[PDB]
Amino acid sequence: GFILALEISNMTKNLKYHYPSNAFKFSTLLGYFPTIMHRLAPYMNLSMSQKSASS
Amino acid sequence: YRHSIFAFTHVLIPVWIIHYYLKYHVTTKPYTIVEKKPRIFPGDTILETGEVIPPMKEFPDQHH
Amino acid sequence: SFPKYEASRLSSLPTTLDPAEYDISSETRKAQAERLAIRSRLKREYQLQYYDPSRRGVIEDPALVRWTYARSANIYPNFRPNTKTSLLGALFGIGPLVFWYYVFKTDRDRKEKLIQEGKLDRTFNISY
Amino acid sequence: TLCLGAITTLFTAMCALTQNDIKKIIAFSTSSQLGLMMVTIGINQPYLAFLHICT
Amino acid sequence: DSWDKDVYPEPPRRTPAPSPQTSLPNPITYLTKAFDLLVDRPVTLVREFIERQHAKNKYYYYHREFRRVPDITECQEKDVLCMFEAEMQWRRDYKVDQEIVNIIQERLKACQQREGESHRQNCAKELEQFTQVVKAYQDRYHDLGAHYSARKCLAKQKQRMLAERKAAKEAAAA
Amino acid sequence: SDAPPLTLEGIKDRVLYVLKLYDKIDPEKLSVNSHFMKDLGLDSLDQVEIIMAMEDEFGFEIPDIDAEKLMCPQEIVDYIADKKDVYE
Amino acid sequence: MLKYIIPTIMLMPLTWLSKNNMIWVNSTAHSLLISFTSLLLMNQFGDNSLNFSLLFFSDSLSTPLLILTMWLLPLMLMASQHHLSKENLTRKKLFITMLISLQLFLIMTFTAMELILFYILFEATLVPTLIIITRWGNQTERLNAGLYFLFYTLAGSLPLLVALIYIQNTVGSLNFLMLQYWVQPVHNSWSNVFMWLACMMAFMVKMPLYGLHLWLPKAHVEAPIAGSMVLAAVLLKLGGYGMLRITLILNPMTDFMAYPFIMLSLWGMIMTSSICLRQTDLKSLIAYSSVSHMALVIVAILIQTPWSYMGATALMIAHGLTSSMLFCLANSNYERIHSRTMILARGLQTLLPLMATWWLLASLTNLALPPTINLIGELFVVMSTFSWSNITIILMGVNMVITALYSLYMLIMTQRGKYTYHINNISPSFTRENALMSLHILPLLLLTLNPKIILGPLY
Amino acid sequence: TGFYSKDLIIEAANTSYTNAWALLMTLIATSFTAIYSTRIIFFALLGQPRFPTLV
Amino acid sequence: HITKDMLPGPYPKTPEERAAAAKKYNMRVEDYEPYPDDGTGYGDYPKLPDRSQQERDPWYDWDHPDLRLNWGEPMHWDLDMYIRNRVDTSPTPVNWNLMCKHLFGFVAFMLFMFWVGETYPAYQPVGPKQYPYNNLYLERGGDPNKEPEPVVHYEI
Amino acid sequence: GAHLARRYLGDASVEPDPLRMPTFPPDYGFPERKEREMVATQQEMNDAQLVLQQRDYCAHYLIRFLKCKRDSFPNFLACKHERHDWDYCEHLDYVKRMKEFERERRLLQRKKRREQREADMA
Amino acid sequence: YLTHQQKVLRLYKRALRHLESWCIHRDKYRYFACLLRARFDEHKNEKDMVKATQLLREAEEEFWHGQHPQPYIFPESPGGTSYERYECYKVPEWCLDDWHPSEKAMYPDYFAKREQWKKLRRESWEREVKQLQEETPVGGPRTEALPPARKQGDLPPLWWHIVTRPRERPM
Numbered sequence A: 001g002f003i004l005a006l007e008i009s010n011m012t013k014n015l016k017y018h019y020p021s022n023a024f025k026f027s028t029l030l031g032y033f034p035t036i037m038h039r040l041a042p043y044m045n046l047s048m049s050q051k052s053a054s055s
Numbered sequence B: 001y002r003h004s005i006f007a008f009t010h011v012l013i014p015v016w017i018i019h020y021y022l023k024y025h026v027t028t029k030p031y032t033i034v035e036k037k038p039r040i041f042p043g044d045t046i047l048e049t050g051e052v053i054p055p056m057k058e059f060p061d062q063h064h
Numbered sequence C: 001s002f003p004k005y006e007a008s009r010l011s012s013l014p015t016t017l018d019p020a021e022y023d024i025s026s027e028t029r030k031a032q033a034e035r036l037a038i039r040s041r042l043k044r045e046y047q048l049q050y051y052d053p054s055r056r057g058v059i060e061d062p063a064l065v066r067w068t069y070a071r072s073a074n075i076y077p078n079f080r081p082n083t084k085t086s087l088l089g090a091l092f093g094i095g096p097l098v099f100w101y102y103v104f105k106t107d108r109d110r111k112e113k114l115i116q117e118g119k120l121d122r123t124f125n126i127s128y
Numbered sequence D: 001t002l003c004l005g006a007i008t009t010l011f012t013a014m015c016a017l018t019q020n021d022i023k024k025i026i027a028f029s030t031s032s033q034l035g036l037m038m039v040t041i042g043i044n045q046p047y048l049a050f051l052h053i054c055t
Numbered sequence E: 001d002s003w004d005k006d007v008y009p010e011p012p013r014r015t016p017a018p019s020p021q022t023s024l025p026n027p028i029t030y031l032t033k034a035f036d037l038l039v040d041r042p043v044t045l046v047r048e049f050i051e052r053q054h055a056k057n058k059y060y061y062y063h064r065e066f067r068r069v070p071d072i073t074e075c076q077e078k079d080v081l082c083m084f085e086a087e088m089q090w091r092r093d094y095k096v097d098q099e100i101v102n103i104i105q106e107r108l109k110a111c112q113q114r115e116g117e118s119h120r121q122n123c124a125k126e127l128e129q130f131t132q133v134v135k136a137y138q139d140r141y142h143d144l145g146a147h148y149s150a151r152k153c154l155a156k157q158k159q160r161m162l163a164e165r166k167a168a169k170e171a172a173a174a
Numbered sequence F: 001s002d003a004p005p006l007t008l009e010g011i012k013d014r015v016l017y018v019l020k021l022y023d024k025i026d027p028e029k030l031s032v033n034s035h036f037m038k039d040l041g042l043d044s045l046d047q048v049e050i051i052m053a054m055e056d057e058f059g060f061e062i063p064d065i066d067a068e069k070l071m072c073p074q075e076i077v078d079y080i081a082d083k084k085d086v087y088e
Numbered sequence G: 001m002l003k004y005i006i007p008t009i010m011l012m013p014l015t016w017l018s019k020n021n022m023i024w025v026n027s028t029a030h031s032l033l034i035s036f037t038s039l040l041l042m043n044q045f046g047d048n049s050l051n052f053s054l055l056f057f058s059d060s061l062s063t064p065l066l067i068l069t070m071w072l073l074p075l076m077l078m079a080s081q082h083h084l085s086k087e088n089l090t091r092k093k094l095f096i097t098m099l100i101s102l103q104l105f106l107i108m109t110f111t112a113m114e115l116i117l118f119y120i121l122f123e124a125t126l127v128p129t130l131i132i133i134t135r136w137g138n139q140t141e142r143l144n145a146g147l148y149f150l151f152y153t154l155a156g157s158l159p160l161l162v163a164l165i166y167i168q169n170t171v172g173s174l175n176f177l178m179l180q181y182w183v184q185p186v187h188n189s190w191s192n193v194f195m196w197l198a199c200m201m202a203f204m205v206k207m208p209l210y211g212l213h214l215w216l217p218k219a220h221v222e223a224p225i226a227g228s229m230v231l232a233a234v235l236l237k238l239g240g241y242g243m244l245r246i247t248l249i250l251n252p253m254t255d256f257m258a259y260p261f262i263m264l265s266l267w268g269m270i271m272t273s274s275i276c277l278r279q280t281d282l283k284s285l286i287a288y289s290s291v292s293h294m295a296l297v298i299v300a301i302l303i304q305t306p307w308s309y310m311g312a313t314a315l316m317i318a319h320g321l322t323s324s325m326l327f328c329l330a331n332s333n334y335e336r337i338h339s340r341t342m343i344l345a346r347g348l349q350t351l352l353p354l355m356a357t358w359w360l361l362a363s364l365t366n367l368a369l370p371p372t373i374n375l376i377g378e379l380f381v382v383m384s385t386f387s388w389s390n391i392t393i394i395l396m397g398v399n400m401v402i403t404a405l406y407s408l409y410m411l412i413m414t415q416r417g418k419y420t421y422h423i424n425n426i427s428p429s430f431t432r433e434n435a436l437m438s439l440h441i442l443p444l445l446l447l448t449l450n451p452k453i454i455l456g457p458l459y
Numbered sequence H: 001t002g003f004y005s006k007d008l009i010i011e012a013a014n015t016s017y018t019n020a021w022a023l024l025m026t027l028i029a030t031s032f033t034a035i036y037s038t039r040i041i042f043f044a045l046l047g048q049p050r051f052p053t054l055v
Numbered sequence I: 001h002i003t004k005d006m007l008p009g010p011y012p013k014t015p016e017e018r019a020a021a022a023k024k025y026n027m028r029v030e031d032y033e034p035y036p037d038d039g040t041g042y043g044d045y046p047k048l049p050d051r052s053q054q055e056r057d058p059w060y061d062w063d064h065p066d067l068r069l070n071w072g073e074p075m076h077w078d079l080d081m082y083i084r085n086r087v088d089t090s091p092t093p094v095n096w097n098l099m100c101k102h103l104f105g106f107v108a109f110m111l112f113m114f115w116v117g118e119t120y121p122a123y124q125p126v127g128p129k130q131y132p133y134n135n136l137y138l139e140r141g142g143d144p145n146k147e148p149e150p151v152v153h154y155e156i
Numbered sequence J: 001g002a003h004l005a006r007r008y009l010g011d012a013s014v015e016p017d018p019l020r021m022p023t024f025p026p027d028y029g030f031p032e033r034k035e036r037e038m039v040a041t042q043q044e045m046n047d048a049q050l051v052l053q054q055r056d057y058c059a060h061y062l063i064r065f066l067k068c069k070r071d072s073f074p075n076f077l078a079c080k081h082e083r084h085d086w087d088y089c090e091h092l093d094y095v096k097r098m099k100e101f102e103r104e105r106r107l108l109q110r111k112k113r114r115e116q117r118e119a120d121m122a
Numbered sequence K: 001y002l003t004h005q006q007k008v009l010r011l012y013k014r015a016l017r018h019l020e021s022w023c024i025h026r027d028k029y030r031y032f033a034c035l036l037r038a039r040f041d042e043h044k045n046e047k048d049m050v051k052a053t054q055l056l057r058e059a060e061e062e063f064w065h066g067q068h069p070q071p072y073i074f075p076e077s078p079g080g081t082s083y084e085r086y087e088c089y090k091v092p093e094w095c096l097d098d099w100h101p102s103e104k105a106m107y108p109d110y111f112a113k114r115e116q117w118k119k120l121r122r123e124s125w126e127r128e129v130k131q132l133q134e135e136t137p138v139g140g141p142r143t144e145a146l147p148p149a150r151k152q153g154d155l156p157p158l159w160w161h162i163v164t165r166p167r168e169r170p171m
């Protein structure tokens, strides 16, 4: 793993372009877990808490 | 001097209170302090009764 | 081409990738300019009081008052018992209550038999 | 516990391969190391998990 | 002594005599010697002075003894005067039993710590006593409810005996 | 925070020191008062790079609603001065 | 109990015969002396209760509710000194008279050995409570609040009156001590189903039970500060105290009659906790918190185990100090901004550093941080309901999550963030305000050291 | 410090009646530890300084 | 002290009413859209877009910077749910549908592989490690009475 | 492991099941099978408070090592020789429990030959 | 509303930042920043107004598809790691009217100086009100920004909070 780290690290120094992938965005945004759960459950809970439970 | 005072009011005084508390109010009641009995081994003498535990049998051991 | 952005209630359409800002219509400019009028007229009212040194207290905000009034006091006088409200109330109010009754009632009947028979482990159970 | 730790030691480490913020990188490292401890408890080596805790 | 030794038994201790092999010293021994010089002795003086004062004006508090009274089984129906004394005594015995169980539990936990890694074998009679008393405790006081009383306790007992006698009676017919 | 406070003279010196490695503005012509469209005639998109150059020099990033309004090396000092409470 | 009744009556002459400028000082001082003397009720024995006379007695259930009651009266007088500042003297001395008369009915209610004497004083608390709400409320909705608070209670109290009298003609006595020895089991017949409901629905409404709670958001929100404090601190516990007594004579029918009221409580516990997540009124949010917390008391009382009763008693006392404290904290903000909207004044921790500490301590007890008695009471009910049904842990665990969410949300929407720019009249915290909070929390935190005195008769 | 706990775990994990997939996740994660660790060193100790001028 | 002519009211069923409602709420009559008159109690309260307060210009000079509102601006029916401490609706770099597919797929495969790795364990070649005295019968809490069937292990 | 591929991808009735290790008849098959001796019989093991699992056979080796540690304190670097002795004894014990693996594995490849011999006899 | 000029300028500002985040290294940023700078020059001479919009709607789309999933943010901006980190220290200025004399005397110069500003505002306020009402359409104000000081002595209307806003680094 160490060798692959340096070899991949040096590849960034090359002046080639980059292709936004899906794994990279999957790893970048924490696997999307803190973008659906942190935006869906608050919406489901805080919408039921108002339109159904209270109103 | 700063440490001598600190070791006095923050270590010596609290340990006096705790030892007095443990030795005359905690230990005077059953099972408040319970000690895991010491690990006894063959070839030792018990300080309290003078009992001696026979050593283990001969070892059929080898080198290396 | 690229997969066009698809919106959702939790992910709005980006302003850039929206076919609504680039077009410059006669009614749009005279409208978007009109929104900034009231949006600045109200700021003037707030700006005057916010700075008046002969003023101590709280600036009553009618928008805030209207917001809380509709959330609490104006709901009932605008409620009509219809198909949607009745069905929603029945399955949101009675549904959970009936569901949990059978969950617990089934379990306690199951436990009672295992205790009356003696087939349940209560060897050390003396705190209840 | 073994499986729970095994996924955690992988998923969080994967999220750390593309993270930028230094604290975030070290944060996901703790999650991966915590997952490694859970793996230890899942293989019936509790003291090794304790040993890993102190070190 | 402070606590009775027949209630809280403790096996006689056995501290192994030190048999050092290394030439280096034992800093624990020095700290042990230092501890009982700067801590134990200064503390021991203060207790002795306080001990002397307590000895100058000794006074005694006694352990209240409750005269036995007729039990609920000997009380007529709806006789509050006889029921009252029967119920109060039952509640007192209930509190004593709640502490007998705590004594056996306290002994059980005491053994487990003392025997260390050998608790699963050495601590076997303590568990046996604990299992027996809890069985006795559970039979008398359990499933009575928040509004427990002697009457409910009596009715539960008479339910258990009927189950036993019917089983015993039909046991002979096997 | 252990960072020495920025002095008013320090900001202006830094601003010109930024606008002297551009290779597109004459070092002998640019001063505290030097427009980018009316005096030395610089490209509009070069302002964005000029603004970006300032942000990478001072840390804080200027909004793209008043940064556009800044084409006067002195005015960049004016904006940066009234974003770090520098009075001397 | 005359040693506490007569002093309470003598506060009324004290208020009326005191100097025009010393009504608050004298009433507050002598009310604190009565509270101090109430500590003598703790002479409790392990087998018998402290039976004073044919009329009054005090056991381990009544004693903690008596001390909280007599301790609450001094604190209600401090809280009322602000909004009763431009009020004329005669009406100020009438307001104090109503508060004193309410305490007098309460201590006698908690010690009445006869269940019909309990009923009369139980209902007698409505009159002064209604007068406080409707005569010294600030809003137009106070008039409607009193009607809801009055007819919800009487809709359930009158059936209780019939049931209590029917029991006397059957058993022969409503004296509580006699019932402990003459109680007979209840058969499973339709007649006894409605005898059960009549004896219980009078207390479910006051707890309140979910479904029968619509009066609380209207009464606790429109009442003055003193009314809200007593309404949520003691008067809700009148329902709890009633069940703990009258459930003695309802076995074994409580085994199945309690199912509909455990689902309303267990589920209604989640619903009302959820409502607090979206409330736009700080006082209303606290009112719905009482409904969520009192849902646990109903469950504990209806499952009838030694651990449930111990938890219920500690929960009732724990909630009494916490709920009263939260109302006082919310009123200090109101006395400045004069608006109950929660999103109107923010970032108050920047302007009132010490009052924010009280907010934190109040919120932590509300969410049952151990080892506070808030947690001890809630924990014991959770242990007892687990044995009642292991699946209940799901409902009482979800409630814990929601309780922490709306309690800290309340602490974040008002104390943290950015201060409101256009609000410039947030003056520093008066000594009266700070001392009012310290009296709520210090006894609440002190009871942790010796909590056996609030664990009820089954300790 | 870390070898005396971390490595002992892998030896016990590999040589135990364990879950095959869980074992593979632990080993893959260990490799990921070197990759993001090298990310911290390379991007904050080696190369040329990307930080501003007056620091 | 606001009268019942500046507060919310019933649904508007005529063009004239909609105009007054828009003026009441400080909105452009064309931008004022009442909630559907479904009888759930919304009345004539404007249905503003379901946009989070996080989706507002952070650089503009707000009257309430923390909430991002202007004094007098009509407030969203769910403003307390769309404050910056709660539900956010800002655009995401990856479409919502695509994110759920990938997250669901990752979790689904991972659990399946744990199940596959559970029925196919990975052990080393060893035997039933031996212990003395009838498999530590007396050490393992066994009853001293009723001694077990002799269990004995031989060399190899 | 390596034989796992032989039991999951390859044949099944050749490798011995770790949870079904030899149920074949008793020591019969190897003439004069002995009994492994125990040094710390019952009380010596239950006097050093050895862990329930540690006292397998090398308890005497472990007891000897623990004696040195209690004595060599504070010389923790010492007793390295005794630890190796205890480790080596368990190393032999590991191979002994490892011989039973191949021992039964070959006893299975031998048991199939008779099974296949009779199957194909006709 | 933004102008078609600004939208292109904004998209150029974002592109370099997002481009910078991908490159990390400064040398590779220059090699790629210029190429992006070059591509704008291609259509910089465009004067169609119907195909410039067409490309812009494809310029934003091109940017969106390749935007960084974690763009660098300066640590005091709307999204940085120190945004509003000091808002808890930004106490208002009106709070000093509530200080006790026993602690107001701690700074005799400060509060003697304060009365000057209150006088400078109390006397100036009426003039500031007059100036705004006389420079506004009869219907009402139509935009933001306010007239500056016209004559001498008068300060800009609505200046107190702008001038006296809490210092951005109170402590």
Ligand SMILES: CCCCCCCCCCCC(=O)OC[C@H](COP(=O)(O)OCC[N+](C)(C)C)OC(=O)CCCCCCCCCCC
Pocket (backbone or CB within 6 Å): A001, A004, A008, A012, A018, A023, A024, A026, A027, D014, D017, D018, H027, H028, H031, H032, K022, K023
């Ligand atoms: C013995 C066990 C195996 C040992 C070897 C480890 C496994 C091989 C992979 C290591 C190399 C690596 O993942 O590289 C990590 C690289 C490094 O960032 P970069 O994109 O190169 O540079 C970043 C800057 N850019 C983009 C401008 C050049 O990030 C990636 O590619 C992003 C995705 C990482 C996770 C992909 C694997 C997860 C698969 C599971 C489902 C998501």
Ligand SMILES: *C(=O)CCCCCCCCCCCCC
Pocket (backbone or CB within 6 Å): H014, H027, I122, I123, I124, J001, J002
């Ligand atoms: C027995 O259970 C072996 C388990 C080991 C799993 C890791 C295998 C790693 C092999 C990588 C290839 C190395 C070839 C020299």
Ligand SMILES: [Zn+2]
Pocket (backbone or CB within 6 Å): G082, G083, G334, G335, G336, G338
């Ligand atoms: Zn006020």
